[PDB]
Amino acid sequence: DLRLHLLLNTSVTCNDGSPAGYYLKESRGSRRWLLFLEGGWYCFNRENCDSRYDTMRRLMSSRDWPRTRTGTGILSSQPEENPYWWNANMVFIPYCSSDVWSGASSKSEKNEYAFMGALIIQEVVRELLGRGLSGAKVLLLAGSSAGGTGVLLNVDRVAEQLEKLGYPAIQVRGLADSGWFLDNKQYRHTDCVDTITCAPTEAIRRGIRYWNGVVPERCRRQFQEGEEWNCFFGYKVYPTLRSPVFVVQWLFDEAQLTVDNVHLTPVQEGLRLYIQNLGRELRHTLKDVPASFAPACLSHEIIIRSHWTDVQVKGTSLPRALHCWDRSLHPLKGCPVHLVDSCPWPHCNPSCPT
Ligand SMILES: O=C(O)c1cc2c(s1)-c1ccccc1OC2
Ligand SMILES: *[C@@H]1O[C@H](CO)[C@@H](O)[C@H](O)[C@H]1NC(C)=O
After folding, report:
1. End-to-end CA distance of the chain, in Å?
2. Where, by residue number, is the active site?
3. Whose CA is nearest to atom 13 of ligand 2?
4. Fewest Cβ atoms closer than 10 Å to its Cβ: which of 81, 150, 295, 307?
């Protein structure tokens, strides 16, 4: 189990002003640290944040969080379940800011909610330095879904923070799972007139203003004022980053299909071509990403699932690919790091989740 610690700086808060926090399991013999960012969509105006507060309150508040959580998948401490990093120091950071980990605003007379995701990450890192992180050799910032996008948005800021604090020996790296989305044309189209009809580019542009959202500096300088929404799309932000980042993305991600207005309920020609083109576009965006794992499956998230070791690309599992990545950062005979399926339809890979 990992144990809850609420932040000592109580000005760094969840949406409703309750303190943010993290769950920790230490491993005294290890200089590796894994910090995992939870996902779970986002909200972008008063009305849709109010509805999320009624029925997804744990994603907006710490008031009802449990004292412990069980580590699963890459957060498991058993080698049977986690061949990659079972002996690491483990940290799970709950997602309670509804801002794709980008916000820097407090609750105030002008703001019903606080959006502090970018500041939560910085405050967790600062408080962990006194609990053993000061001795680390590697800090892997990982995450799934909105947390995977959060890795892309925050990994270089963590590296800069540690350099300015006097810890240049800590190697900061990123692992982004199920957070690599396309701003493509939808299968069916609606103008942004409410929450369900608002496409991701329009919803994120509104969110950034509502959250006071922040993006990495080199990406911000490319796209400039009013266009920072571009930095939430992995294929645009990734080439601006300096830290090493491993990208995990299903070629037919269920959240991508949802935002494209596709619902697989017999598939006719128009939809068959749409799905095949989506897989080809995703593959194209990964061509120049040297550390990547992209199976041809219809699914969502991988790294904290208990059976995460089962899926393989070209005969190599994800825990193996991550180990090969570690070796590469010290090509390798029989230890590959670039693993992207080429077959064109979901479940053409027999190891896909059932
Ligand atoms: O399940 C979740 O947490 C998420 C689903 C999506 C997210 S996060 C997203 C992040 C950036 C750009 C577009 C996006 O649309 C789909
Ligand atoms: C607490 O967090 C706020 C917001 O990030 C920051 O401005 C302030 O310096 C922090 N104070 C301490 C003592 O950590």
Report:
1. 28
2. 145, 253, 300
3. 9
4. 307
CA distance 33 to 27: 9
Domain span holding position 216: 1-354
Q: Tokens 């991550």, residue?
A: 322
Please tell me the total count of domains within the chain.
Answer: 1
**How far, rounded to the nearest angstrom, does the alpha carbon of residue 165 sit from its chain's CA centroid?**
25
Polymer length of the chain: 354
The residue annotated as part of the active site, out of 105, 300, 317, 341, is 300
Answer yes or no: is the C-beta of 187 below 6 A from any ligand 1 atom.
no
Amino acid at 116: M
Query: Does the CB atom of residue 96 touch ligand 1 within 6 A?
Result: no
Question: In sequence order, which residues have a C-beta less than 8 Å from that of residue 27 and are 6 or more positions away?
Answer: 77, 87, 88, 89, 90
Distance CA 45, CA 51 (A): 10
The structure was resolved to a resolution in Å of 1.2
Q: Which of 18, 30, 62, 145 is catalytic?
A: 145
* DSSP-assigned beta bridge partners for residue 35: 91, 141
